[PDB]
Design a protein around this ligand. Structure first.
Ligand SMILES: [Cu+2]
Ligand SMILES: [Cu+2]
Ligand SMILES: [Zn+2]
Ligand SMILES: [Zn+2]
Lengths: 151, 151
């Protein structure tokens, strides 16, 4: 608990460092991401901290509340979803988010979990068809990292 | 926290994959490691999570009860002490340990911290003096992984 970090790496040029700090009931997520394609991209916490098959072994979005996929904002959201980060350039940006949903407090604690940044934007809470409604239509994950304590 | 994995990456050619199964009020740690040397290698859970700047960043052996360094077997040792991993002739280490002190469970939980392998042996807190008592001497890093939650 309290104060955690995650370093985003991949087989592509995408890298970043994200920090997470509990500020009571909420988690403040900050950081930089670089080496991207300009615009918004899918930013989620994927159920496992497994790097045995790269960013694939992470699996789906952490949803301990069996639900569907949305934005940070929808009630109908996946604990694991934090929406989209926006890049500009270089092909960098912006991580500052405050979440009432995720944690590190157990049963909804996001540590030992993987942080992924996808290669396309999230349809967030609304839009698509099947893969929208539990995925984002974000797609190819180019960087991921297991979330670990810090202090 | 009923299962975990760690992917031992290092900045040398050193590497392995270790598995943790909460099978009792005992955690059974399994795996292999390649890259090594011969010999016993220090094998320890360093209190922290990100390698945001290498194996350096992991800090010191997780010691919640501010005690001194020792061996697995011991009553005066860090939760982080798992001892040594002996190597071969070439390439491999075989890890087979059960530990009464770690867990994934909560508290003394090792999910989110770092699994490190050191050059040289851990001479279990007493062989030596001042640093033994700490580090174990068991010498230097170069493969570490953030322990994460496993399917
Ligand atoms: Cu995702
Ligand atoms: Cu150590
Ligand atoms: Zn989702
Ligand atoms: Zn120690």
């Amino acid at each position: 608990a309290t104060k955690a970090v995650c370093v985003l790496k991949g087989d592509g040029p995408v890298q970043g460092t994200i920090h997470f700090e509990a500020k009571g009931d909420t988690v403040v997520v900050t950081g930089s991401i670089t080496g991207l394609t300009e615009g918004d991209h899918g930013f989620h916490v994927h159920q496992f901290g497994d790097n045995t098959q790269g960013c694939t072994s992470a699996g789906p979005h952490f949803n301990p509340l069996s639900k569907k996929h949305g934005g940070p904002k929808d009630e109908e959201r996946h604990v694991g979803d934090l929406g989209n980060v926006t890049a500009d350039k270089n092909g960098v940006a912006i991580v500052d988010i405050v979440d009432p949903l995720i944690s590190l407090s157990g049963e909804y604690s996001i540590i030992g979990r993987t942080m992924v940044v996808h290669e396309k934007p999230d349809d967030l809470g609304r839009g698509g068809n099947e893969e929208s409604t539990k995925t984002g239509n974000a797609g190819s994950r180019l960087a991921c990292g297991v979330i670990g304590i810090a202090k």
